[PDB]
Design a protein around this ligand. Sequence first.
Ligand SMILES: OC[C@H]1O[C@@](CO)(O[C@H]2O[C@H](CO)[C@@H](O)[C@H](O)[C@H]2O)[C@@H](O)[C@@H]1O
Ligand SMILES: OC[C@H]1O[C@@](CO)(O[C@H]2O[C@H](CO)[C@@H](O)[C@H](O)[C@H]2O)[C@@H](O)[C@@H]1O
Ligand SMILES: OC[C@H]1O[C@@](CO)(O[C@H]2O[C@H](CO)[C@@H](O)[C@H](O)[C@H]2O)[C@@H](O)[C@@H]1O
Ligand SMILES: OC[C@H]1O[C@@](CO)(O[C@H]2O[C@H](CO)[C@@H](O)[C@H](O)[C@H]2O)[C@@H](O)[C@@H]1O
Ligand SMILES: OC[C@H]1O[C@@](CO)(O[C@H]2O[C@H](CO)[C@@H](O)[C@H](O)[C@H]2O)[C@@H](O)[C@@H]1O
Ligand SMILES: OC[C@H]1O[C@@](CO)(O[C@H]2O[C@H](CO)[C@@H](O)[C@H](O)[C@H]2O)[C@@H](O)[C@@H]1O
Ligand SMILES: OC[C@H]1O[C@@](CO)(O[C@H]2O[C@H](CO)[C@@H](O)[C@H](O)[C@H]2O)[C@@H](O)[C@@H]1O
Ligand SMILES: OC[C@H]1O[C@@](CO)(O[C@H]2O[C@H](CO)[C@@H](O)[C@H](O)[C@H]2O)[C@@H](O)[C@@H]1O
Ligand SMILES: OC[C@H]1O[C@@](CO)(O[C@H]2O[C@H](CO)[C@@H](O)[C@H](O)[C@H]2O)[C@@H](O)[C@@H]1O
Ligand SMILES: OC[C@H]1O[C@@](CO)(O[C@H]2O[C@H](CO)[C@@H](O)[C@H](O)[C@H]2O)[C@@H](O)[C@@H]1O
Ligand SMILES: OC[C@H]1O[C@@](CO)(O[C@H]2O[C@H](CO)[C@@H](O)[C@H](O)[C@H]2O)[C@@H](O)[C@@H]1O
Ligand SMILES: OC[C@H]1O[C@@](CO)(O[C@H]2O[C@H](CO)[C@@H](O)[C@H](O)[C@H]2O)[C@@H](O)[C@@H]1O
Ligand SMILES: O=N[O-]
Ligand SMILES: O=N[O-]
Ligand SMILES: O=N[O-]
Ligand SMILES: O=N[O-]
Ligand SMILES: O=N[O-]
Ligand SMILES: O=N[O-]
Ligand SMILES: [Cu+2]
Ligand SMILES: [Cu+2]
Ligand SMILES: [Cu+2]
Ligand SMILES: [Cu+2]
Ligand SMILES: [Cu+2]
Ligand SMILES: [Cu+2]
Lengths: 338, 338, 338
Amino acid sequence: DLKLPRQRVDLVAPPFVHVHEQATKQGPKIMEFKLVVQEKKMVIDEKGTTFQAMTFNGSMPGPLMVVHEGDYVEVTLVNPATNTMPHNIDFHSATGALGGGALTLINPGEQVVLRWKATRTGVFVYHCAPGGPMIPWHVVSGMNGAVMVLPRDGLNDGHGHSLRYDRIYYIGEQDLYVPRDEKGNFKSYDSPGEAYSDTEEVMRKLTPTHVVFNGKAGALTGKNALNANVGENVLIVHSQANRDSRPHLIGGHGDYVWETGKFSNAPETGLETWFIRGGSAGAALYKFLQPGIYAYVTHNLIEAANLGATAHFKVEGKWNDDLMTQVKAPADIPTGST
Amino acid sequence: DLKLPRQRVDLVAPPFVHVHEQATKQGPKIMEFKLVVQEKKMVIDEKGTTFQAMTFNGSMPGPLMVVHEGDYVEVTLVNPATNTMPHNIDFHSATGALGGGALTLINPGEQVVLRWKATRTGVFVYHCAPGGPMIPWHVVSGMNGAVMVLPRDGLNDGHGHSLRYDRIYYIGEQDLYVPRDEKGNFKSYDSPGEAYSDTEEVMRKLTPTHVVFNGKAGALTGKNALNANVGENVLIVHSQANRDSRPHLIGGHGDYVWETGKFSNAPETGLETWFIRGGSAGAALYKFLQPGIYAYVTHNLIEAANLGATAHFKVEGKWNDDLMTQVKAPADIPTGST
Amino acid sequence: DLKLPRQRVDLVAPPFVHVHEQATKQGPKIMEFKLVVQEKKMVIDEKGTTFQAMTFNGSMPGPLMVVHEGDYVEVTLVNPATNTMPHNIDFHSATGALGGGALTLINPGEQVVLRWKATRTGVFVYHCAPGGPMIPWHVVSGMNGAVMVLPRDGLNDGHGHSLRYDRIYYIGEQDLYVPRDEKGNFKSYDSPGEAYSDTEEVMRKLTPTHVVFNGKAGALTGKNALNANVGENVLIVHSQANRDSRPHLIGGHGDYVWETGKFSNAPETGLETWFIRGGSAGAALYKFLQPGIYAYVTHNLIEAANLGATAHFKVEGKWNDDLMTQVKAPADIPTGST
Ligand SMILES: OC[C@H]1O[C@@](CO)(O[C@H]2O[C@H](CO)[C@@H](O)[C@H](O)[C@H]2O)[C@@H](O)[C@@H]1O
Ligand SMILES: OC[C@H]1O[C@@](CO)(O[C@H]2O[C@H](CO)[C@@H](O)[C@H](O)[C@H]2O)[C@@H](O)[C@@H]1O
Ligand SMILES: OC[C@H]1O[C@@](CO)(O[C@H]2O[C@H](CO)[C@@H](O)[C@H](O)[C@H]2O)[C@@H](O)[C@@H]1O
Ligand SMILES: OC[C@H]1O[C@@](CO)(O[C@H]2O[C@H](CO)[C@@H](O)[C@H](O)[C@H]2O)[C@@H](O)[C@@H]1O
Ligand SMILES: OC[C@H]1O[C@@](CO)(O[C@H]2O[C@H](CO)[C@@H](O)[C@H](O)[C@H]2O)[C@@H](O)[C@@H]1O
Ligand SMILES: OC[C@H]1O[C@@](CO)(O[C@H]2O[C@H](CO)[C@@H](O)[C@H](O)[C@H]2O)[C@@H](O)[C@@H]1O
Ligand SMILES: OC[C@H]1O[C@@](CO)(O[C@H]2O[C@H](CO)[C@@H](O)[C@H](O)[C@H]2O)[C@@H](O)[C@@H]1O
Ligand SMILES: OC[C@H]1O[C@@](CO)(O[C@H]2O[C@H](CO)[C@@H](O)[C@H](O)[C@H]2O)[C@@H](O)[C@@H]1O
Ligand SMILES: OC[C@H]1O[C@@](CO)(O[C@H]2O[C@H](CO)[C@@H](O)[C@H](O)[C@H]2O)[C@@H](O)[C@@H]1O
Ligand SMILES: OC[C@H]1O[C@@](CO)(O[C@H]2O[C@H](CO)[C@@H](O)[C@H](O)[C@H]2O)[C@@H](O)[C@@H]1O
Ligand SMILES: OC[C@H]1O[C@@](CO)(O[C@H]2O[C@H](CO)[C@@H](O)[C@H](O)[C@H]2O)[C@@H](O)[C@@H]1O
Ligand SMILES: OC[C@H]1O[C@@](CO)(O[C@H]2O[C@H](CO)[C@@H](O)[C@H](O)[C@H]2O)[C@@H](O)[C@@H]1O
Ligand SMILES: O=N[O-]
Ligand SMILES: O=N[O-]
Ligand SMILES: O=N[O-]
Ligand SMILES: O=N[O-]
Ligand SMILES: O=N[O-]
Ligand SMILES: O=N[O-]
Ligand SMILES: [Cu+2]
Ligand SMILES: [Cu+2]
Ligand SMILES: [Cu+2]
Ligand SMILES: [Cu+2]
Ligand SMILES: [Cu+2]
Ligand SMILES: [Cu+2]
């Protein structure tokens, strides 16, 4: 019945994004994606703490899917027989059937195929939602990602000017609720099911033990810092499926920010810190003006520095002393100071 | 002195709203409302937990009052002699005297009459505020509601087009702080006064034990699901007098959202999740496009599924397979899969 | 090299602000400021609780710095030898080198001079950020303030009309994490270093023990209430370097609010409650219409009334009975009531 060209997309692991066009003159297509659920123990912090994760495609977050307004998105969701739990998928981008969750519940050993029309532009969360208390548990166990639905003319500033990014990164932020023993040490389990009761008790007190980008403390620091160059316009897509976040690029700004994440609304300009509502994605464009290290954080600095929520950008280029300069290096306070 | 026609309004219990006009050619009126304080033990969760509530008109939230810009609102607040505490009322819609709280403190056995001019359009919180620590306690005990002040021309999209709703619902969200004994069981008390000291200790740690719509977990699910039909534009007014919330309609969107709740500002379009600041009301319009069950949640999914904060809509109509379809029902994974 | 006139500014303690022009016909200048770090024990609540604070210029918050777009800001940061820790400064208004933190780390007995160009309009946080876990600790110990970068034409309403304030106040909100002993009493220490380990444990649970304006519970109440007059337009700058806040003027509104704090964006109009993202500053203009006491709060009322986060305005003038009136004072409920 639906007689449109089909295009298969190969997803890539965050924080990278699969190849796509911004502006397009192609007409609507059926864009075909595959997501495979993987339950596995994962390391989440720099001390080696593990937890029983549940993921789309083996990553936290799940991969970013990119389509254009008016495309149809045909998703095959696979739940391999090595998994222990039923899973499904809910797209905040989609209309009807609890975002697709009501049509995608699959037991281990099954797959399902859902199609949804991309009628709404923006970045949106997708997440597992099997029913009842399983909804938060699967989400906070890692089963969430995002999809971006671009206008066919690409982004704009809300005032009739096109905006084009040179690079895009997807930062998925995850709140984790890891059980502790009586002495405060994190507990380990042999399966997600075995971890559930203790995990739910932590969840109920609404205070995460970890808040991480790309699935673990330090994931996007060191050798996995995000690269850019002076003069490049970088789009940073940020999602949080369960809990608020307040992104901030230390030493930079958000030149154009869609904090609610929807491109039918004009972006705000020149922000210091923006706000991602739990259960949403947002996006910020920034043109780098200075080289060096930048930290990208949630600006609850306790979370950023002590719970895991810091990424780095490493930016190549020449320093601009007009924008900022050290006039006088650290020196002893003059004795003739009052 | 104030020589305007008077109109008595009969309030109704949430989530319904008293009859009113959207656009009106009537001139300003004195709109007369009565609120009666009721202290009573109420069931707040599906396991039968009770707590010592304090309410306007016997409901959590208090009823939605609806007037138009330039009306005067004359409120009789009654504190029956069966109550134990003084009470008052503060309208975030009103100008002066702490929103009216400074002019409305009444002991049991007393009533008071306040008039305020509706100079500011939007949805606004009202709440009790007797003074000092009694302010949070009365609010988190249930003494809060909302008022909507419509433009006389009804709603608009901020771009010169009228917006009209077919149905309106008022969802009041309440954070509750129920004491526990040493084993974790909820405690019961014979009066609000007896509950206070233990309740304040819970309040101080800023983590609710329950987060509910319309006064209890499950209030707006099952047989009390909210009704709508495909094609209807539904206005959902959401308030939270004390704590942030992040509303989301699962399987839908916010077509037009005033998250800060004030109709002098253009709405945002096509949101997935919006944000109600503690101490405010907001509103979202959505035109249903698909039949079925929708869950309306705060998108902290722990709160939604585990603390009580889920409502349902039941939407009648015909399914649109263009917007979404199950291409292939759950099936075994092909053996020839890699 | 940089051949512009230099102007020395003398800062004043919050909530007041140093003298400045709104609109200016002056060209760009090098605006010279000095900040001196002071570590000291400070009283933070009405029961006399102390804590080991770290401050810019002896105050929490640090002073508000005011410049215009295109000015250069040359800041001398001094760390006296009586201090125990290294300190630095990061300006969210500045571009590069982690906002200046990477160029300003000074040991006790040293000073440093940083210059940054004010290319972005708005109110912005500045804070200490020495590295790693020291970042949140220094911030939540008091080392944060704000800077305002005005357009050279002053404020506007986003619709081509100038806005001018008669008075400005800077409200810095601080979340504090004071250790308790086994019985719940707050602990005291002889130095910041000695307090660190216990303080970090509190910080990790993300629940403050105190939330205060201008450095202590009750700071801006009583004889230190903020003054205004009916008819005056008052700008209230609000910052929070670490944690969200939801400001509300009880009995008033935000006539024009920049909740994200950046003057390149049009303000929202007629708000009840607004939202300051942790790691940002915002600003609200209000024209007082009624005399009397107003409370300015974060509208988590537990925080406001029980954790310290209430300020007062005392407004002189004549009451307007058109806006609000007590029609009938408290009286016994008529016996002939049903
Ligand atoms: O012996 C505990 C010690 O070993 C580490 C190794 O990096 O991790 C082990 O214990 C953790 C806490 O139970 C587990 O999460 C992990 O699975 C296990 O290898 C340290 O983290 C831990 O302190
Ligand atoms: O708005 C994007 C997209 O949403 C649809 C529904 O699929 O329209 C919705 O939003 C419109 C514009 O705000 C409303 O007028 C409409 O009533 C509502 O369903 C699409 O038609 C539109 O392209
Ligand atoms: O956090 C409480 C308490 O637990 C201990 C071990 O007894 O440390 C645990 O908690 C730390 C904070 O989350 C982690 O850094 C560490 O991995 C974990 O074992 C104590 O060191 C701490 O006081
Ligand atoms: O890119 C940052 C990196 O560049 C160096 C020189 O290679 O210094 C530049 O950046 C500094 C600010 O971070 C400037 O103060 C300096 O003048 C400029 O040359 C490195 O020192 C720095 O890490
Ligand atoms: O015996 C405790 C058991 O009875 C229930 C009945 O539904 O409720 C009682 O105890 C609760 C906890 O103290 C009270 O809140 C309630 O008022 C009382 O009827 C169960 O909830 C409870 O577990
Ligand atoms: O704005 C709605 C309503 O507020 C009033 C005061 O009651 O005006 C306020 O807002 C105006 C427009 O933003 C400001 O110009 C004014 O100074 C401020 O008092 C009413 O006059 C107006 O209808
Ligand atoms: O929550 C702690 C602990 O308390 C128990 C009873 O000892 O359950 C209580 O708490 C549950 C979570 O809020 C409620 O579902 C129940 O109504 C309440 O009695 C334990 O079951 C739980 O481990
Ligand atoms: O309204 C939802 C309700 O309708 C039924 C048929 O009565 O199925 C419709 O809705 C489904 C999605 O929820 C579609 O997949 C189906 O094709 C459509 O007919 C019920 O199965 C469903 O609960
Ligand atoms: O004896 C404790 C008692 O004295 C007070 C005096 O106002 O403060 C003392 O103890 C506090 C808690 O340790 C300290 O923070 C403070 O430095 C010290 O003077 C009371 O607050 C306290 O309850
Ligand atoms: O926007 C204020 C200020 O920022 C600068 C950079 O210092 O420009 C940024 O914002 C512009 C307008 O949004 C973008 O076009 C530009 O690419 C970005 O660097 C200044 O040029 C401008 O005055
Ligand atoms: O808060 C727990 C518990 O501690 C006590 C003293 O044992 O009070 C402390 O905590 C109160 C709340 O923060 C403070 O008002 C007071 O300054 C502090 O000593 C108990 O009174 C309270 O139950
Ligand atoms: O400014 C508030 C202050 O003024 C007084 C009279 O001096 O009363 C005025 O304000 C009241 C509302 O707060 C009005 O009801 C009254 O009519 C008006 O004269 C004081 O009573 C009040 O504290
Ligand atoms: O599908 N839930 O475990
Ligand atoms: O300025 N960053 O924390
Ligand atoms: O009026 N307060 O309990
Ligand atoms: O998509 N709702 O959780
Ligand atoms: O400089 N840090 O303690
Ligand atoms: O209306 N103020 O809490
Ligand atoms: Cu799942
Ligand atoms: Cu969702
Ligand atoms: Cu009350
Ligand atoms: Cu209020
Ligand atoms: Cu410092
Ligand atoms: Cu910062």
